[PDB]
């Protein structure tokens, strides 16, 4: 549970 950066987006993402 923890937030990653997207490179793609520019933006972080919620992952498991």
Not at 2 to 16: I, R
């Amino acid at each position: 549970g923890e937030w990653a950066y997207n490179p793609a987006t520019g933006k972080f993402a919620w992952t498991e």
